[PDB]
Request: fold
Amino acid sequence: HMLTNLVAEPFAKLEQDFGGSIGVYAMDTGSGATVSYRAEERFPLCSSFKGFLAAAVLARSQQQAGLLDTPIRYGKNALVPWSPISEKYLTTGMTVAELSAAAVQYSDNAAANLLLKELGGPAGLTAFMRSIGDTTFRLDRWELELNSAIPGDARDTSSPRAVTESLQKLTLGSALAAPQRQQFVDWLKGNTTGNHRIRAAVPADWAVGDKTGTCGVYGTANDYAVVWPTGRAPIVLAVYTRAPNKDDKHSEAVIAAAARLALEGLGVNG
Ligand SMILES: O=c1cc(CP(=O)(O)O)c2cc3c(cc2o1)OCO3
Reply:
């Protein structure tokens, strides 16, 4: 509890300036030390479920060889706002692996819905999360309905701690086989949507993979990441926000500041 107490006050000040709630869980995988702030509260996943979705696809690809190379064709009605990759391949289709990369690295919404369909919907993704020991995660809806971020609504939420614990298992632990684990890491490392969030807190010489989420209402946005500082074990962390009013805006700078405090609390000089 020592490290959590070290940063309790700056976290409270940060969220009060933000005007909402900030949830953080950070784990140093070397020492096992952790930093928590509102780490067991539920926050909306927004797009951050798409990382776990790709991991669930990779897990299935261990038993279904050729799943990743399977071409998926889709119609115009499958396109959803913020489908920047899949809209370019509407007339050709894309492979499951390409859809997974697009979902992770561009937060592509049509790609996410197509992969959800492959897995049996929100309950199928939830079942995968249960299979790795995550009893907190729940996905209930599809894009874009899952972004409603209604205060008090448990649908389409998890906790920062559960997100970090599941991310650790999938990227560093044994939840995925070694080739699939590295592919998941590589997709996270190539994300293009998180330059102003956890990455803004990480020195240029450290490797980082992340997945963002932005609900667009209720000041609700997030990012989770694995960070490989030089000379020490990797850090896994999750930063989630929400706010009381529908029109409250999220803040990427607040997410970056919260990540900085978490790393400072862990003693990670950065
Ligand atoms: O700033 C953002 C960033 C994201 C991508 P991510 O942070 O969720 O991953 C975003 C995605 C959207 C959207 C607005 C968004 O605003 O409307 C439909 O899909």
Q: What stands out?
A: Residues 49-63 form the longest helix (15 residues). DSSP finds nine helices and nine strands in the chain.
